[PDB]
Amino acid sequence: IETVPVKLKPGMDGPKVKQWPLTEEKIKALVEICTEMEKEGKISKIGPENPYNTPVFAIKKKDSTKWRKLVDFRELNKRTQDFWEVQLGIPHPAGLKKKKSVTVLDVGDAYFSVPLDEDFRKYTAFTIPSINNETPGIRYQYNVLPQGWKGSPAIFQSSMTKILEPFKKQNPDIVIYQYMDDLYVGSDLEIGQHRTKIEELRQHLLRWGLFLWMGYELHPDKWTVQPIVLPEKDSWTVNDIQKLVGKLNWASQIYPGIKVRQLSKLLRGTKALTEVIPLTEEAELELAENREILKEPVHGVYYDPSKDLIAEIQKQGQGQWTYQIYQEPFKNLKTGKYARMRGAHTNDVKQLTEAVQKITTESIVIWGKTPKFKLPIQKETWETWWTEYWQATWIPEWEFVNTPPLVKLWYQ
């Protein structure tokens, strides 16, 4: 009914992406889920004349007994046309990040109400593998807007608008933002009735047609940043001064006015690393001038919607992780630190996977897009484990860092 024509971008074929190995429990889950989707008309079995593939796996969101199918559409998304057709795109709301509470809803099930263009369905092909390839993999494609595909929120947008219209007119101060399968709803209300307002929202979706009941509570107004701070000490060792001059040298790339000359003079001669050195007056003045410089914002920092966001992460030890989001080197758009647990105390890779998810969430809230990650992990280790910890319905792009950054110690 009223199918929107969709195309790949010029000169591109559909995705052929290998299905990665799935555990028995994930395969069983996916067989059950897909058997039901097939009965409901959402997917159909396909024949050998469809060469395309996109990987699929299954996740369990936070505190739930049910598996959720997750298709990794990253390749299809790159290869799918940008949508200029009717809408020129929404300006990203700048007020969302200022709200006291933002709840995240998974609305993706609504997409299944819209048929997918018959000519484009083949590009949604996916396979449920069998253990040890003992039986033929089960091959399906979508008949309707799939969750995880960038085209789905685009094509459904005129429907979502009508759905939320009474809630928006009734609650003009509440910010609603849609990214992929997620709806982000912010408000300044007391948490008890914020929760009522979102539940009021759920009903509009629940009443219309047909994991929605879930919600993920954020408080972005309390989100912090990490300015460059220098130690305040009564006695400085040679080693302390060396680390200070190192950190200032690094900072001077970000802040031009930074000077190390007087501090660098302090160590004069070759002294024991642990020896205490009294600061000269010139050294104290310089340090003071440097502190004041570091209280000001970085010069010439601006977000460009046309450039990728890059996120770097450092493992600081004891469950602590620092990160920076930028576009251009030394102009950081956001920095942050997670000192936290949420299980994972004996698992580094789980911690990193949770950090990646938290950073991507912040990115979506602030800029409305996901960044490209530089991960401090060996590719094979990440690729083996990340799907075990993944609770998000989207997936960002990543690359791997194999050389230890010297700058880790300065974000500590």
Next chain:
Amino acid sequence: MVPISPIETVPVKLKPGMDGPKVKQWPLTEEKIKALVEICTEMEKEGKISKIGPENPYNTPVFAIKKKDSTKWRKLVDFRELNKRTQDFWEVQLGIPHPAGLKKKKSVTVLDVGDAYFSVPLDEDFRKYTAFTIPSINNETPGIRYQYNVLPQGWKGSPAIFQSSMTKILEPFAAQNPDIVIYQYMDDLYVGSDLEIGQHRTKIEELRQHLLRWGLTTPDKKHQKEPPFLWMGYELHPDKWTVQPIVLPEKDSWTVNDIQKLVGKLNWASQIYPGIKVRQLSKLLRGTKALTEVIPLTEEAELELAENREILKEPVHGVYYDPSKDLIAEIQKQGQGQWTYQIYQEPFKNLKTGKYARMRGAHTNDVKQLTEAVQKITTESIVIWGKTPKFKLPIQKETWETWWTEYWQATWIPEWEFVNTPPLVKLWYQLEKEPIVGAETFYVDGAANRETKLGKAGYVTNKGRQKVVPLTNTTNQKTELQAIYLALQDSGLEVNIVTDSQYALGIIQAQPDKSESELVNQIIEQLIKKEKVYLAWVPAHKGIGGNEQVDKLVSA
């Protein structure tokens, strides 16, 4: 007649912008022509091909070849051109099962489905592209033109479409008979089960009746194939599996091609025979690529070869998978970046074995390699069994804990226990987190002239100890490492070292226990002898005491 269910055709297209083949038919001898006409007349009467009119523009060449040293002929249609122009397909069978993931079976029966193999209909709209021409006797009449109504042998889409069609037919049978397994390859259909023999035979008769729904007839005379089966380089038996015989040739002289074949056999053998090593043999294959060249075997390659011969002296078999039991994976370090592993359920009976080799890299260490081996085995295990094995690893729990908590990267290995089975993986050194009180402090530097390759490396200390060494044929990076080496060599058991070298810090922060670099190896050997080492970095050219003084010394 008994109505039969038609096989639904798969719609097929040429690649975008491509037309069908038009390829000249080469002349044939009068004999070949008579043979092809007969062959095609038979094929045509059973409906496999049909005569076509002059209007079809397409052509694919046809040949007449022979069976083995005798009188009979076979038709070969060369589809190379049509294949280039045909769309890609999804093949159900690719990524074959590993025997180690199979389940033991009391009975395995084989059925002959060769008549289905040649009977699957081809999409009506695509048939025209399959056109071929038997040349006329003497070229005095139009050649006889035919096209295919069924999947042709040699055509790009035949295997995928045959597999998909057979799958669709078998699916309801398999689904409603969870007590059997089925596998189909070419003209054979295999059915295994644990059923009482009476029940098993009944199942086979039911399958035969099922297949009859599509008109596929299975010869009543029973199959001459029974276990053990030779399949895909393996031997499958009802209760055990192995690789087909591996016999290592004797020769006084070895050739590139001979060595490649040897390594190939050894790699194949390594999935069952524990402890197979290819390092020194694959080493002889480096960067040559002239297949007739004779390479003298190193003493190391000879040792490896003899070690392999002993491993291969008598047959070894794997058992099959029991889903009711835990999978255990045990790994051993073999030296030279080589690792070996066994996967088992009950002690002393392996499901399979295998090996892992260290990645190409400038610097490395045993803990990283063991971690890599674990992730590889983990991924293989997910493929074969759908679950991660519990690991038995030659590294102490305390060693692992010290490693991962201090390593600059996130790292993880899944549930595992220490097995004390030398050689053990250990940390050969760990650097201090804070400067050492009472330890001498060495400020090191090195520099080289990029033109002449002359350089200097050295240190100065808080005790007034100093050294500068002149160096030739060196680089700034090498001099920076040489300076750290000198400080290690000349200091006591506890030492603080201050360097400006980001290059050296990056190497040392990677924690190598072994290097392609001679100098890094010497540094590692010295670190191993220390009780405590603190390594401090400072930026160059900043006026940092002991750093200039040594920087100035080493510059000129």
